[PDB]
């Protein structure tokens, strides 16, 4: 029974990033062969084609848990800013809730996209590349229960990086 998992790093990160390496390399050091991107917006890259065509319409996007968060990929992205539930823990590779746990003192999620999973190139913190104060990138903060909020967050604050499995 179909479904593609949401999870989020295990540690949060400024704007400096090897996504999809991350992903890879948590998703397996949790035991999981499944082929894992980064939730993100880059060069040349919009967060709505990360995930596979075949996929996007008829697998709800649940999270380390099997708990529901969307109901499809497509529905995300079109315009609401991807309102969830956050009453439902939003969970790490090794397991911890990002929503409650300390260790994420900031919860708000990189993203670098309009609210149509379209990147930004001048809100992306130069392609995950910059840690500098003086550059941003658009990021969500959870409290307002969306994924894709239009917020302004420095590249030099450590937040939440999300990853989907792009394809079953």
């Not at 315009?79 to 539930?85: H, K, T």
Request: hydrophobic letters at 40%; a positive charge.
């Amino acid at each position: 029974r179909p479904v593609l998992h949401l999870v989020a790093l295990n540690t949060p990160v400024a704007g400096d990033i090897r996504a999809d390496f991350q992903c890879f390399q948590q998703a397996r050091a949790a035991g999981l062969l499944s082929t894992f991107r980064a939730f993100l917006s880059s060069h040349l890259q919009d967060l709505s084609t990360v995930v596979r065509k075949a996929e996007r319409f008829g697998l709800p996007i649940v999270n380390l848990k099997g708990q529901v968060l969307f109901n499809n990929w497509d529905s995300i992205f079109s315009g609401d800013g991807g309102q969830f539930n956050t009453h439902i823990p939003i969970y790490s590779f090794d397991g911890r809730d990002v929503m409650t746990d300390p260790s994420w003192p900031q919860k708000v999620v990189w993203h670098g996209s309009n609210p149509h999973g379209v990147r930004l190139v001048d809100k992306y913190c130069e392609a995950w590349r910059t840690t500098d104060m003086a550059v941003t990138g658009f990021a969500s903060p959870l409290s307002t229960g969306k994924i894709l909020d239009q917020k302004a967050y420095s590249c030099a604050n450590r937040l939440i990086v999300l990853c989907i499995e792009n394809s079953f």
